[PDB]
């Protein structure tokens, strides 16, 4: 039993899919990408069950059944098949073997990241690595498999009967964002803008005084100035500032008989401290930390396969494992015990990646390359909606969280995506305290819909704006 999705290219992929679509009667009435979804899932009954349930286990079971029901038949077949294809499995795993050096900042610190908040550089490196991986393996074959780079949706149209529920979700999301989150002279910023054009002689008499002068609180006005400039003009300024300083150093060297060597070397040295410091302020911002912690679902999923020692030849068993899990929902404890008992060597290796019991801070801070029991669903949407050993079993339906993002958002179908997110939230809320969870899956799902994701296989790192500012109408 090998991987039956023998596809090594887009053309190869299209033909495999046409057969399959015809064979299985896939529709796109309620989904962006063709799927098994013949009708919007009705999760109503799970609210009443939840409300009549007393113990924690009954409640987890009710919620887990709702989530599977929500997702069972709406997997985006084309993209899931592409993500699990023989070609992408080989390239996607091999990439880690060929690029080990570029991801070492987080990969070689995996053990620490199971415990501690990541450094911002570990977050940035992971995001850049995810885009590189996508580019290098040719992951993009359509808009559903692209890296997004437009802006968040200004408006989000939902049916009138869930407007207040969506607005309540956003209030809690903004409450969370604000908990997470909780003066530069305009003339100094303008000096920096002129300096970085290559006008290095300006460094001999800045308007604030000495070139090293710190404002409040003990930080060099040059650093805060450039950092403040970068927010409006972009990262290029740092590059341009370094070039300008190198230009100065050439000048002081050419005209060395007209200059005091020691103060000329100190000024060059000191400007470089200030340019480096300007990035440490720029980079170390909570807005960049929050964007930088967003998981790239497919990238992180392939990283976990790599770390677990999965091969193209054993991959179909990972796929099968995940497929069974979304077909018949069961407890987290039972999923975890199955990894510890499986004869497959990858079982225990995947298990050792879990950070559930080791991570010492609010989970929102966890590095996006760190596995948890709840992140098994990321792998499940990539490799588990279709069992690659017998793909037609996808018709039985295997439900993984992010298949929800394949549900349409348009008004012709009245946004079954949003209806379903809301109903999951209401169900979670009936049975448990929202505010006590570090992570509310349905809120993560809304956020992602609000940034404009219409597939689980999109990367939204370069989407600009604040999703949570959307006007719900």
């Amino acid at each position: 039993m090998e991987n039956k999705i023998e596809v090594n290219s887009k053309d190869e992929m299209n033909k495999w899919f046409e057969e399959f679509k015809k064979g299985n009667g896939l529709v796109d009435t309620y989904t962006n990408s063709y799927s098994f979804c013949e009708s919007v899932p009705n999760l109503d009954r799970f609210v009443f069950q939840m409300a009549g349930a007393t113990d924690d286990a009954q409640k987890d079971s009710i919620y887990a059944s709702a989530l599977v029901e929500a997702t069972k038949f709406c997997a985006p077949i084309y993209e899931c098949a592409w993500a699990s294809s023989t070609g992408i499995v080989k390239k996607g795993l091999e990439w880690f073997e060929k690029n080990t050096g570029t991801i070492k900042s987080w990969d070689e610190s995996y053990i620490e990241l199971k415990v501690e908040v990541p450094k911002i550089e570990q977050l940035f490196n992971y995001q850049q690595a995810a885009l590189k991986w996508r580019k290098d393996i040719g992951f993009r074959v359509n808009a559903n498999t692209a890296a997004l780079s437009n802006k968040v949706l200004a408006e989000y149209k939902v049916p009138g009967e869930i407007v207040m529920s969506v607005k309540e979700m956003l209030s809690d999301m903004i409450r969370r964002r604000n908990l997470i989150l909780n003066p530069v002279s305009h003339e100094h910023v303008e000096w920096c803008r002129e300096f970085v054009k290559g006008k290095y002689i300006m460094a001999f008499n800045p308007p604030w005084g000495d070139i090293n002068k710190s404002g409040r609180s003990g930080i060099a006005l040059v650093a805060t100035g450039l950092a403040k400039l970068a927010e409006t003009e972009g990262k290029g300024v740092f590059d341009e500032a370094k070039k300008t300083v190198e230009a100065l150093n050439g000048y002081l060297d050419k005209h060395k008989d007209e200059v005091d060597k020691a103060s000329a070397d100190n000024m060059v040295t000191n400007l470089l401290k200030h340019v480096a410091k300007a990035q440490e302020l720029y980079k170390n911002s909570s807005a960049l930390r929050a964007q930088g912690a967003q998981i790239d679902t497919v990238f992180s999923s392939y990283y976990w396969l790599y770390k677990a020692g999965v091969t193209p030849e054993t991959f179909p068993t990972v796929s099968q494992f995940l497929f069974e899990l979304g077909k018949h929902p069961r407890g987290t404890k039972k999923m975890k015990k199955a990894l510890l008992s499986t004869p497959m060597k990858w079982g225990k290796k995947l298990y050792e990646l879990f950070a559930d019991d080791s991570f010492q801070q609010n989970r929102i801070y966890m590095h996006p390359a760190v596995l948890t029991a709840g992140r098994i669903s990321e792998m499940g949407v990539c490799f588990g909606t279709i069992p690659v050993a017998n793909p037609d079993d996808a018709a039985l339906g295997s439900g993984h969280t992010k298949s929800i993002l394949n549900l349409r958002t348009n008004t012709e179908t009245n946004n079954p995506c949003a209806r379903t997110i809301v109903k999951l939230f209401e169900i979670q809320k009936t049975g448990f305290n929202i505010q006590d969870m570090d992570i509310v899956a349905s809120e993560h799902l809304l956020h992602q819909s609000l940034v404009g994701k219409q597939s689980p296989f999109q990367n939204a790192y370069n989407v600009k704006g604040n999703a949570t500012s959307a006007n719900i109408i």
Side-chain angles (χ1 to χ4, degrees), residues 114-133:
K114 282 175 56 159
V115 176
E116 317 278 9
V117 170
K119 293 149 260 158
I120 190 65
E121 288 80 7
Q122 295 173 300
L123 293 178
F124 287 159
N125 181 291
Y126 161 93
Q127 299 294 341
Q128 298 316 118
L131 295 164
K132 186 166 163 48
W133 178 93

Side-chain angles (χ1 to χ4, degrees), residues 8-27:
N8 306 285
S9 68
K10 188 168 160 150
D11 276 351
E12 282 184 10
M13 182 75 221
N14 286 339
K15 285 195 171 196
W16 185 98
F17 178 71
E18 281 298 303
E19 171 237 22
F20 192 96
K21 174 189 161 184
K22 104 181 222 77
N24 289 280
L26 300 184
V27 287

Side-chain angles (χ1 to χ4, degrees), residues 63 168-169 171-173 175-176 424-443:
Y63 175 80
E168 174 188 336
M169 289 178 80
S171 302
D172 184 56
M173 294 156 72
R175 179 191 73 86
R176 287 164 189 278
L424 291 157
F425 177 79
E426 292 167 331
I427 293 165
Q428 308 182 210
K429 191 162 97 117
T430 299
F432 310 95
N433 196 348
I434 285 309
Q435 284 82 20
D436 274 33
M437 303 178 88
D438 295 358
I439 291 309
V440 175
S442 57
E443 290 180 4

Side-chain angles (χ1 to χ4, degrees), residues 37 39-44 66 69-72 74 407 416 419-420:
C37 192
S39 61
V40 178
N42 191 330
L43 310 183
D44 281 350
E69 177 132 352
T71 57
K72 211 183 180 344
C74 68
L407 282 166
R419 286 183 272 123
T420 306

Side-chain angles (χ1 to χ4, degrees), residues 42-198:
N42 191 330
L43 310 183
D44 281 350
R45 77 190 181 275
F46 299 102
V47 170
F48 306 120
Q49 291 181 24
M50 194 59 88
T54 297
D55 64 277
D56 295 312
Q58 207 186 353
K59 291 187 175 192
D60 296 315
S61 173
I62 294 154
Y63 175 80
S65 296
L67 184 54
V68 166
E69 177 132 352
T71 57
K72 211 183 180 344
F73 297 114
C74 68
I77 294 299
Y78 183 88
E79 291 78 19
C80 293
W82 173 251
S84 288
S85 60
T86 50
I88 294 292
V89 166
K90 273 182 278 163
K91 290 194 290 197
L93 287 166
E94 187 57 7
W95 187 96
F96 292 95
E97 221 72 70
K98 295 155 67 167
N99 287 281
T100 294
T102 28
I103 74 164
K104 67 161 80 142
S105 66
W106 44 280
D107 174 57
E108 284 187 357
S109 288
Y110 193 88
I111 291 167
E112 184 171 33
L113 293 176
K114 282 175 56 159
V115 176
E116 317 278 9
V117 170
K119 293 149 260 158
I120 190 65
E121 288 80 7
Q122 295 173 300
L123 293 178
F124 287 159
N125 181 291
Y126 161 93
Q127 299 294 341
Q128 298 316 118
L131 295 164
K132 186 166 163 48
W133 178 93
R134 289 167 168 258
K135 282 214 70 169
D136 291 354
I137 77 171
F139 187 67
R140 191 203 169 115
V141 288
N142 60 19
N144 291 338
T145 52
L148 291 167
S149 83
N150 274 20
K151 298 179 179 304
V152 302
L153 301 170
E155 325 263 317
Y156 195 61
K157 179 73 204 324
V158 300
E161 62 160 315
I162 72 165
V163 162
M164 266 32 106
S165 281
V166 169
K167 283 182 170 177
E168 174 188 336
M169 289 178 80
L170 285 172
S171 302
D172 184 56
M173 294 156 72
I174 297 168
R175 179 191 73 86
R176 287 164 189 278
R177 184 173 177 280
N178 287 0
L179 281 184
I180 290 159
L181 276 37
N182 295 275
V184 187
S185 163
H186 201 62
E187 289 148 62
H188 299 166
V189 175
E190 181 55 52
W191 182 96
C192 290
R193 186 169 12 245
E194 286 287 325
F195 174 78
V196 308
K197 284 110 167 260

Side-chain angles (χ1 to χ4, degrees), residues 136-440:
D136 291 354
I137 77 171
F139 187 67
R140 191 203 169 115
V141 288
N142 60 19
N144 291 338
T145 52
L148 291 167
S149 83
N150 274 20
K151 298 179 179 304
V152 302
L153 301 170
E155 325 263 317
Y156 195 61
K157 179 73 204 324
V158 300
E161 62 160 315
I162 72 165
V163 162
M164 266 32 106
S165 281
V166 169
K167 283 182 170 177
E168 174 188 336
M169 289 178 80
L170 285 172
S171 302
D172 184 56
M173 294 156 72
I174 297 168
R175 179 191 73 86
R176 287 164 189 278
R177 184 173 177 280
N178 287 0
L179 281 184
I180 290 159
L181 276 37
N182 295 275
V184 187
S185 163
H186 201 62
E187 289 148 62
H188 299 166
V189 175
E190 181 55 52
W191 182 96
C192 290
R193 186 169 12 245
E194 286 287 325
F195 174 78
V196 308
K197 284 110 167 260
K199 297 180 189 173
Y200 49 77
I201 297 163
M202 296 172 74
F204 303 159
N205 68 321
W208 60 75
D210 194 62
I211 198 62
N212 300 308
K213 195 178 179 191
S214 36
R216 267 155 43 155
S217 296
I219 204 140
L221 298 167
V222 164
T224 57
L226 274 161
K228 189 67 156 44
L229 202 306
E231 291 169 311
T232 215
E233 188 143 296
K235 278 180 184 180
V237 167
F238 307 123
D239 332 24
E240 307 308 307
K242 182 165 168 284
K243 184 178 285 179
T244 287
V245 180
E246 293 166 3
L248 181 70
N249 191 49
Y251 182 86
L252 296 163
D253 180 36
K254 288 156 178 49
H255 302 272
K256 67 197 175 179
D257 294 5
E258 298 300 342
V259 146
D260 288 314
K261 195 177 195 325
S263 45
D265 292 343
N266 293 340
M267 181 166 287
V268 161
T269 297
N270 284 339
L271 277 160
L272 296 172
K273 309 301 184 149
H274 305 324
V275 174
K277 185 64 183 177
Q279 300 178 50
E280 309 202 63
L281 296 162
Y282 183 84
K283 295 161 151 279
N284 293 255
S285 80
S286 314
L288 282 167
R289 170 170 299 275
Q291 192 73 339
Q294 273 170 25
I295 181 165
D296 183 332
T297 296
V298 72
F299 180 65
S300 278
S301 291
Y302 264 96
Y303 175 63
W304 295 323
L305 294 186
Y306 159 81
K307 291 298 274 197
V310 176
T311 75
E313 291 72 32
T314 56
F315 171 82
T317 74
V318 177
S319 170
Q320 196 76 42
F321 187 96
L322 296 160
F323 172 78
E324 301 296 320
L325 220 58
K327 183 174 64 171
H328 299 131
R330 77 290 303 275
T332 294
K333 187 86 303 185
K334 290 160 173 41
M335 182 277 282
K336 285 170 86 183
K337 302 292 161 186
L339 294 172
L340 297 176
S341 60
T342 183
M344 300 307 303
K345 280 177 185 156
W346 66 256
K348 276 176 188 85
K349 296 174 187 145
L350 196 69
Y351 187 101
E352 188 63 342
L353 307 180
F354 288 147
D356 303 68
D357 287 328
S358 58
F359 197 78
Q360 295 183 346
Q361 304 293 327
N362 191 310
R363 264 45 161 10
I364 198 59
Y365 292 124
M366 190 174 283
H367 188 283
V370 180
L371 192 58
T372 60
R375 282 173 168 182
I376 281 285
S377 62
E378 302 283 315
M379 301 184 76
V381 70
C382 299
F383 315 132
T385 69
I386 304 171
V388 299
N390 290 291
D392 283 320
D393 287 351
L396 300 168
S398 179
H400 303 277
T401 304
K402 279 173 181 171
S403 291
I404 280 160
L405 291 176
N406 194 35
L407 282 166
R408 290 180 178 280
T409 57
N410 48 88
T411 317
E412 294 87 341
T413 53
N414 262 208
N415 197 347
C417 184
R419 286 183 272 123
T420 306
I421 287 172
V422 160
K423 215 70 150 86
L424 291 157
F425 177 79
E426 292 167 331
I427 293 165
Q428 308 182 210
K429 191 162 97 117
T430 299
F432 310 95
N433 196 348
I434 285 309
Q435 284 82 20
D436 274 33
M437 303 178 88
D438 295 358
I439 291 309
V440 175

